[model samples]
Target chain A: FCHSSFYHDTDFLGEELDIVAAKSHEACQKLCTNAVRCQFFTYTPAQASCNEGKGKCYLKLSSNGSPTKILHGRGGISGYTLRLCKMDNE
Target chain B: FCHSSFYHDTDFLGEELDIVAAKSHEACQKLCTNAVRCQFFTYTPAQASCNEGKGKCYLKLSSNGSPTKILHGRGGISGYTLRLCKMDNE
Candidate 1:
């Protein structure tokens, strides 16, 4: 009945950037925490042919990746589930 | 100790194309939901002397209101949250 869903970059493909191996979505989230300009990101699985940027993280956004608003009192803070996006969660 | 914090438009204000009358924050959120390309928004309360746009909803975003990479393995999708930015709620 309860599992907090996370958000990711789903609008822009982003420019090619550095890659990092993240075992799970939370791990990837932490990766962003460590980065300076990482507002949004995309993670590739370890099984994929994602060399160089393999199992890597792609960070990006439309305008500097930071939107003016974060959460609204009644507005929903939801987007396409990452689980269905092919990224591992558990 | 516990209250679900809402988000607001602290980063970038969306261009005002139109205004919708909403008595409450939940009502404003609904306004954004009905309108496409309305990912972020700001609502001026009814108490304010905001004619035409009074008690109006401001839909917006950093980009065109769409973010790609909607979800990642371990990243958190967060922004300014339109609550503190001031619109209407409760």
Candidate 2:
């Protein structure tokens, strides 16, 4: 399947691997790389309403091989990894 | 192998799946869940000396079985996904 943009707002949630504070989206991305099963991540900016500080980064893993749902805006950004696709191509 | 905590600073690096801004570590973790091949991640707090913004989350994939190296302080946090381990147990 195809996706739009490297980042976007979506409702599809997955198995939460862990959660912690981060400075930016890129920093969270680095965390995903270090994880053992992290396949994607959702970044909720602390700047959003009902948040504080640098915000929270959520590391996650999908059990069904893909996201389960897609919702509207909820004050967050989400994206996936491209390495898997490259492996499939190879 | 076993890991210490859900979140910590480590030097092991891997294939960069992607990078973006996140409000916190939880947000980045969510992004990892949505990805396809993301196994781990590294988060660099923007507040660190030589950083900016909320932070940069790096989604990554390991070509080998695990991380390749371990360095000292580098103003970043690293972790993994537990879903894979659970599957292994089953």
Candidate 3:
């Protein structure tokens, strides 16, 4: 069971494992959840100039429990994966 | 009135403006407090092998209220600058 939190119009800087275009930011959430290695991700919507005609998602590479940095930047959405409830199981 | 807290055996990643050697970690704290541009800093103690010959301090570059990321790395001390006390009078 993984849970995530999101930030808007801000960014989680660095440690990008890969970039994948997703239909929507919510779909990007599904992508990170499906990946065994993705600990977090940042998604830029298609409406933003940074998207360059399509939405972009950044899969973050991080070890569990690692700290992340967030700063105001181009409009974007970011989230993290965590089993915050069940520590002993899965 | 900038106040800071310290962390041990960790690092505040990225946004380094300069590196300056100091006699001690606390001394490094003074360097940041003295600087107009520094918002935070990481100091590697001289006893640690990562220090090369003597203690080293990484003076951070940031505008006030910028967020920072901390992670496990070579042994070091980290701190931040804040006017959390007197918001009006510096």
Candidate 4:
């Protein structure tokens, strides 16, 4: 099923397949669900004020398993897909 | 579609669902694949030398999307699932 929750200050490094600009984390989640391959995602708040890269949302996939050993800091936010879980239950 | 390529020092923050101990990123990938819900993973090299949390692998699901704003430097490695891509292509 559909999992809900946001782990704060935790970062899962690497495995990004696509990137997009979203207004908020909720918007980013919708992007992941829309993408056929997206199973997980990480979002960074727009640093436009800082002249950094566009506050982009990264959509990713793991051929293996989900992430472990997350780093805690201001690295942004990460999470995965719950679609399959619901499918399995159905 | 199987996407490969590890972005050095890149990390996707937040959204962790599970965790495990693995020897390498490849091993972490295997764990993700095995899990029905796992869509992505983040692997950290054993830092027993540093006594950090046992070099663990995090298996996560992003109801939102993949990570965007990643942090660089000695955090860990992350990636997503390729099974869905192949299913779509097929």
Total clashes, candidate 4?
Answer: 49
Local accuracy of candidate 2 as per-residue lDDT tens digits, B1-90 = 534244556534443345666476577677756634345566765553323446667655544433343334443776666443332222
Docking class of 2: incorrect
lDDT (0 to 1) per candidate: 0.38, 0.51, 0.55, 0.53
Q: Which lDDT tens digits does candidate 3 get at residues A1-90?
A: 566688778765443345677466567667755634455576766552222457667665544343444444443677665642333122
Ranking, lDDT, top scorer first: 3, 4, 2, 1
Per-residue error for B34 in candidate 4, Å, reads 36
Alpha carbon deviation, residue A55, candidate 4 (Å): 2.6
lDDT winner? 3
Query: In model 2, which regions exceed 4 Å deviation?
Result: A1-90, B1-4, B48-52, B63-67, B84-90
RMSD of each: 16.8, 13.3, 13.5, 12.5
Q: Is the docking of candidate 4 incorrect, acceptable, medium or high quality?
A: incorrect
For all predicted structures, in order, the TM-scores are 0.26, 0.37, 0.38, 0.37
User: What does candidate 4's lDDT look like per residue over A1-90, in tens digits?
Assistant: 467545546755434355666365576567656634454566766453334435577555543443433445554666656663443222
- Cα displacement (angstroms), candidate 4, residue B87, comes to 35
Candidate 4, superposed: residue stretches over 4 Å from native: A14-16, A22-26, A35-37, A48-54, A63-69, A84-90, B1-90
* Candidate 2 local distance difference test against the native: 0.51
The alpha-carbon RMSD over the true interface for every model, in angstroms, is 17.3, 14.5, 13.3, 10.9
Root-mean-square deviation of Cα positions for candidate 4 versus the true structure, in angstroms: 12.5
Docking class of 3: incorrect
